[PDB]
Write a protein that binds this DNA or RNA. Structure first.
Ligand SMILES: NC[C@H]1O[C@H](O[C@H]2[C@H](O[C@@H]3O[C@H](CO)[C@@H](O)[C@H](N)[C@H]3O)[C@@H](O)[C@H](N)C[C@@H]2N)[C@H](N)[C@@H](O)[C@@H]1O
Ligand SMILES: [Mg+2]
Ligand SMILES: [Mg+2]
Ligand SMILES: [Mg+2]
Ligand SMILES: [Mg+2]
Ligand SMILES: [Mg+2]
Ligand SMILES: [Mg+2]
Ligand SMILES: [Mg+2]
Ligand SMILES: [Mg+2]
Ligand SMILES: [Mg+2]
Ligand SMILES: [Mg+2]
Ligand SMILES: [Mg+2]
Ligand SMILES: [Mg+2]
Ligand SMILES: [Mg+2]
Ligand SMILES: [Mg+2]
Ligand SMILES: [Mg+2]
Ligand SMILES: [Mg+2]
Ligand SMILES: [Mg+2]
Ligand SMILES: [Mg+2]
Ligand SMILES: [Mg+2]
Ligand SMILES: [Mg+2]
Ligand SMILES: [Mg+2]
Ligand SMILES: [Mg+2]
Ligand SMILES: [Mg+2]
Ligand SMILES: [Mg+2]
Ligand SMILES: [Mg+2]
Ligand SMILES: [Mg+2]
Ligand SMILES: [Mg+2]
Ligand SMILES: [Mg+2]
Ligand SMILES: [Mg+2]
Ligand SMILES: [Mg+2]
Ligand SMILES: [Mg+2]
Ligand SMILES: [Mg+2]
Ligand SMILES: [Mg+2]
Lengths: 209, 34, 169, 294, 159
RNA sequence: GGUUGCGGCCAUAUCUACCAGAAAGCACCGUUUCCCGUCCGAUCAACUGUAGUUAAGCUGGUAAGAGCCUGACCGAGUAGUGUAGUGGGUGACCAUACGCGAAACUCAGGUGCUGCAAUCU
RNA sequence: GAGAACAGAAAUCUCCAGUAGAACAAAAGGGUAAAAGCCCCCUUGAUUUUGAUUUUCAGUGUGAAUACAAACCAUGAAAGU
RNA sequence: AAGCUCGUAUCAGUUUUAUGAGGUAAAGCGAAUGAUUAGAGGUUCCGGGGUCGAAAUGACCUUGACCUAUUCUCAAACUUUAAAUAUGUAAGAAGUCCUUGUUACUUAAUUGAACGUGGACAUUUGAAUGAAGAGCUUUUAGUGGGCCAUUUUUGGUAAGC
């Protein structure tokens, strides 16, 4: 089967996810959403590039997987399995249906999944060191051909996967306001109890600098 | 003569509680030997 | 800061969990009557388990609640049976504690082979003056953090009087 | 404390009414007491509020308003030394006495006291006070138990009997009065009369003085010091009913100092709380010792 | 098959507000209602008796009767090309006094008293509100405020 | 101003932790002849106010506390939207015109108010 | 969660927390915490007479429901229901 | 179609002001329900297997489960918040105020609830706009295959469906 992806490209329906009402739906053809060095510290990978969608449309879970593999391959082979963090930013929670007598009672059984994408919504994200910009770009650029419609590749002022365009992050980094979590970080709060705030960020206070 | 204690629960079904099942026992458990 | 608040027993509840209905139950019930001097209370099986042989609502067991000096005397008889040695578990993190013996004849209670031999669960709950703050209908309230029987507190009270031993730990 | 209530839990917690939290007020009972038939419009439902502290008896006649409850008149057991009871302020006869004082005091200030005499006899027989023909109907008042148990022979119904024998209309039944026998299905007025004058307390003085002089010395120590005899109990209450019905009017306390003087003292033991600026100091200061070594 | 019940589709309509549940406070039982009053019907889902049918939710009308626990209310319901008069029996938890009349009454007092202080001084009345009039001539100054001139902004990505 | 009975609004009143509380009140507390209720005078009942204590309840204060309340040109005139064009775009969809205009976020402030009666160095 | 002979994942007994995460015959939705849930006591308002009203609506029938009036009962200490 | 009653009388597919109802759009998920990616810390005497130690109730080893604090992504039959457009009611003479009559209802009560007598206030007669008139009755034709456009929108890959 697998009727062409021309048929489901546009968002014509209210979101129809797997639910207590709708069961017997197939598995997503994309499972792994994080690849590369996924446990690398926030400081490892300053440079962040995004694959951003310029249209309003539905992406198939089959094409997510195809383009996910597509990027990851060119990234590992060129720059090495640990040089990047690729995170798919979009999940296929929408169920397509096929009719598969007459038009009589034509409601569909679930045909597959797709991820609802918006104008400017982020689809793929990668973080590396600045030295690797060219390679990540070509990774995403290679993966755009697996997607329907138009998507743009945007160099993001921001530190890594966090937030806080790199100058602003650097100010908190040599502050002591940055505690390394797993794969992510936590930020010193001026709100919570002064007691466990000082134990949580001993470097800021104290000594305070 | 015959006193019986009142049971405050609302559950009227004759069914095992959620905690009952053969899983979570042990190997050992008491390991009586001789 | 230690005036009233001494410590004491709220109640001692003797529990013989029989496991069936009929002669054996009303028999072991007689033991607690003839021991507590009160009339005992029977519990019903919450649900049927076939492996235990019990059907829901069938009367499994009997217990009885004792308060005041009379409890303090029945507890003493129990601690003799264990030779004034309990274990560090044995003790609720809320301050309560208990133990168990086999063959009830081991404190008073001659024999009566027609009545029979039964063990029982000893559980005793500790509180302080003011425990009716949480038990009263009007203005029900919660005992403060100070007060509030703890496991460290009543283990020490169990060694201080009775001249007995904690164990393990 | 390992129970550790989450921020989400606190947020979705709905608070009960304040008076429900402190556990004073039953709002399922209060809805049914206060609610007025709406074709009767503004006519108030008058409650007989009876409460028992450990040392005292509260009796209040209460109506309700959106802005607040409003009390018509009040009578406490601690007023009873004025009418001759210096002891047993929490006992049954005290309630009957306090119920009679609030019965008499209110309808006095209502101009209904002369009409609707009440009983004045006190054999302990069950009757409501029924309306005069060609005259005003009795002041109707409904018993407010509060959170008290309904038990046969509870002190609160001593207040009820006092107020109904006082001339107020407080509808009721016998079975929660002492002397009601389930098997007999009737009220023995003897025992009830006994409780009105404290027969249950007096017989205890006699059996205790005879059986235990020491224990008797402890409980009734006030009676030995006051030269009050055991069987004289009936005359203390009988005569209190005289002076009460004679002078129901409330006299307030003699009030040493003034409301102003009390206030300038009674709480200046209040801890005054900090300004926001003083708080920024406490924060920046609390920094120092932990900033401190670290 | 199709389902239209008496409470059909009231799921959210008769839900009780976030964190205001359980017992009904006593003020609603202490309000007092007079024939000719104007009332706001909002059903209370915790009180199932004396309940308005979902149509009248939000509707406001006049009370034509007063009973023990309830008021009769008159509502004009359009059916077809005309309105029909409906009489509703509602328990006092589903009812509230309209605050709209309350502004009007207060303005008639204010109007009566304005006309008195005017007639006592023998001067002009003008008790009918005028709508907002366009505006009046102003001189705004430059002392302290020098016009700070603004420019459109270049496109920038923030992602 | 404290405290109590009955309340109104029902977290600015709750939650956690730790302190503090003069006087009255409230409580804990002593007792089991009586009514009354229990497996158990723990609860409920009754008696004394005597033998004891603020230990708890209660009340207040503390916390870069959790929650809750409030305010803002904080975000944002953003998102969403009523109206118009023989506007753009293969389409997806987007920009413009006359109007309406959020939520999250961020910051800042606050932590019961009050009605009737009584009572208090 | 932490505790008590036999006793085990699961018998029965405490204590502590617990905004309802339970239960309310049944479908789902609403509603409910000194209860509308659990247990107990007493009951027959599932009764009498005929009107008015809401929903569907033609403002016909029917089913169902709401508030009174006039009786006779229930229950509770009572207001009430 | 026929009229009938009256006539600035009241009327209105509109605005303004005041005051209600609503749970869609959007928003939310380090807020409940339900789904979903990833690492980190902590607990397990209250799980599977440890390659040392016969001991196994022992340190140490992996992988579960749970707890806490975080992170990516969702909802017609989710939700705290919450529009726009739509929608209910009101803007007086059938009103307002004073005085004090009636009653078998209702109140402890000459209290209230109704419905009145007599007295006072008409300039702008209590928003805007319009109004070419308003109100009312009888009687009877034809129709009860519809279709199209914008926007909202369901089934369908779609359709001149
Ligand atoms: N998430 C993107 C959104 O962008 C538009 O909103 C624009 C908006 O569109 C209008 O939407 C209204 C809806 O009826 C109407 O006014 C007009 N149809 C239209 O011009 C524009 O008038 C604004 N100038 C810009 C705004 N981004 C769309 N309206 C939305 O639907 C769309 O999903
Ligand atoms: Mg569709
Ligand atoms: Mg492409
Ligand atoms: Mg049960
Ligand atoms: Mg938990
Ligand atoms: Mg939190
Ligand atoms: Mg009650
Ligand atoms: Mg009766
Ligand atoms: Mg349907
Ligand atoms: Mg609502
Ligand atoms: Mg609302
Ligand atoms: Mg019903
Ligand atoms: Mg006794
Ligand atoms: Mg006692
Ligand atoms: Mg008692
Ligand atoms: Mg203290
Ligand atoms: Mg705070
Ligand atoms: Mg258009
Ligand atoms: Mg605009
Ligand atoms: Mg507070
Ligand atoms: Mg266990
Ligand atoms: Mg508890
Ligand atoms: Mg009940
Ligand atoms: Mg009915
Ligand atoms: Mg949405
Ligand atoms: Mg939101
Ligand atoms: Mg979050
Ligand atoms: Mg781990
Ligand atoms: Mg291990
Ligand atoms: Mg808001
Ligand atoms: Mg808000
Ligand atoms: Mg026809
Ligand atoms: Mg035809
Ligand atoms: Mg055509």
């Amino acid at each position: 089967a697998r009727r062409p992806a021309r048929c489901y490209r546009y968002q014509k329906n209210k979101p129809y996810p797997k639910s207590r009402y709708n069961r017997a739906v197939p598995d997503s053809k994309i499972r792994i959403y994080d690849l590369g060095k996924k446990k690398a510290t926030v400081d490892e990978f300053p440079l962040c590039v995004h694959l951003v969608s310029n249209e309003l449309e539905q992406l198939s879970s089959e094409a997510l997987e195809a383009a996910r593999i597509c990027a990851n391959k060119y990234m590992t082979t060129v720059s090495g399995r640990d040089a990047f963090h690729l995170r798919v930013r979009v999940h296929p929670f929408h169920v397509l249906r096929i009719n598969k007598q007459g038009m009589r009672g034509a409601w569909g059984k679930p045909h597959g999944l797709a991820a609802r994408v918006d104008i400017g919504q982020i689809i793929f994200s990668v973080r590396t060191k600045d030295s690797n910009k060219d390679v990540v770009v070509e990774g995403l650029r290679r993966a755009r051909y697996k997607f329907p419609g138009q998507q743009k590749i945007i160099l993001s002022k921001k530190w890594g996967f966090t937030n806080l365009d790199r100058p602003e992050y650097l100010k908190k980094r040599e502050a002591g306001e940055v505690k390394d979590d797993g794969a992510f970080v936590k930020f010193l709060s001026k709100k919570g109890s002064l007691e466990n705030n000082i134990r949580e960020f001993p470097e800021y206070f104290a000594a305070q600098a | 003569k015959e006193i019986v204690k009142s049971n405050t629960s609302s559950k009227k079904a004759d069914v095992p509680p959620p905690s009952a099942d053969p899983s979570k026992a042990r190997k050992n458990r008491p390991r009586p030997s001789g | 800061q230690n005036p009233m608040r001494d410590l004491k027993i709220e109640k001692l509840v003797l529990n013989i969990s029989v496991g069936e209905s009929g002669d054996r139950l009303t028999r072991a019930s007689k033991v607690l009557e003839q021991l507590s001097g009160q009339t005992p209370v029977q519990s019903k099986a919450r649900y049927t388990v076939r492996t235990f042989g019990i059907r829901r609502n069938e009367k499994i067991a009997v217990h009885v609640t004792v308060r005041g000096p009379k409890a303090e005397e029945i507890l003493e008889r129990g601690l003799k049976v264990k030779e004034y040695q309990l274990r560090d578990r044995n003790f609720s993190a809320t301050g309560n504690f208990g133990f168990g013996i086999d063959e009830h004849i081991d404190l008073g209670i001659k024999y009566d082979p027609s009545i029979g031999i039964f063990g029982m669960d000893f559980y005793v709950v500790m509180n302080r003056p003011g425990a009716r703050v949480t038990r009263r209908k009007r203005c029900k309230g919660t005992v403060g953090n100070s007060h509030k029987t703890t496991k460290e507190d009543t283990v020490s009270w169990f060694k201080q009087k009775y001249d007995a031993d904690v164990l393990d730990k | 404390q390992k129970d550790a209530k989450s921020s989400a839990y606190s947020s979705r917690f709905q608070t009960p009414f304040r008076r429900r939290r402190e556990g004073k007020t039953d709002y399922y009972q209060r809805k049914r007491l206060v609610t007025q038939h709406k074709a009767k419009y503004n006519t108030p439902k008058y409650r007989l509020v009876v409460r028992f502290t450990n040392k005292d008896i509260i009796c209040q006649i209460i109506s309700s308003t959106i802005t607040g409850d409003v009390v018509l008149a009040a009578a406490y057991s601690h007023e009873l030394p004025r009418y001759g009871i210096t002891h047993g302020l929490t006992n049954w006869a005290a309630a009957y006495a306090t119920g009679l004082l609030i019965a008499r005091r209110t309808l006095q200030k209502l101009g209904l006291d002369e009409t609707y005499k009440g009983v004045e006899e006190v054999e302990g027989e069950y009757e409501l006070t029924e309306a005069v023909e060609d005259g005003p109907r009795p002041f109707k008042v409904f018993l407010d138990i509060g959170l008290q148990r309904t038990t046969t022979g509870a002190r609160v119904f001593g207040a009820l009997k006092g107020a109904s024998d006082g001339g107020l209309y407080v509808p009721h039944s016998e079975n929660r009065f002492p002397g009601w026998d389930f098997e007999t299905e009737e009220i023995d007025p003897e025992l009830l009369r006994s409780y009105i004058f404290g027969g249950h307390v007096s017989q205890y003085m006699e059996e205790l003085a005879d059986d235990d002089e020491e224990r008797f010395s402890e409980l009734f120590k006030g009676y030995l010091a006051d030269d009050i005899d055991a069987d004289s109990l009936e005359d203390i209450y009988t005569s209190a009913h005289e002076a009460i019905r004679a002078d129901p009017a409330f006299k307030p306390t003699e009030k040493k100092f003034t409301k102003e003087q009390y206030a300038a003292e009674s709480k200046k033991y209040r801890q005054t709380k900090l300004s926001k600026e003083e708080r920024a100091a406490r924060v920046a200061a609390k920094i120092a010792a932990l900033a401190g070594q670290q | 098959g199709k389902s239209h019940g008496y409470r059909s589709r009231t799921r959210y309509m008769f839900q009780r507000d976030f964190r205001k549940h359980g017992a009904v406070h006593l003020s609603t039982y202490l309000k007092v209602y007079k024939v000719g009053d104007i009332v706001d019907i909002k059903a209370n889902g915790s009180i199932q008796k004396g309940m308005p049918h979902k149509f009248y939710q939000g509707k406001t009308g006049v009370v034509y009767n007063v009973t023990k626990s309830s008021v009769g209310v008159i509502i004009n319901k359009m059916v077809g090309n005309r309105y029909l008069e409906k009489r509703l029996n509602l328990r006092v938890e589903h009812i509230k006094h309209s605050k709209c009349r309350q502004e009007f009454l207060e303005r008639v007092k204010a109007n009566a008293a304005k006309r008195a202080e005017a007639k006592a001084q023998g001067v002009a009345v003008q008790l009918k509100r005028q709508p907002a009039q366009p505006r009046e001539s102003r001189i705004v100054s430059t002392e302290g405020n020098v016009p700070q001139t603004l420019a459109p902004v270049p496109y920038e990505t923030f992602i």
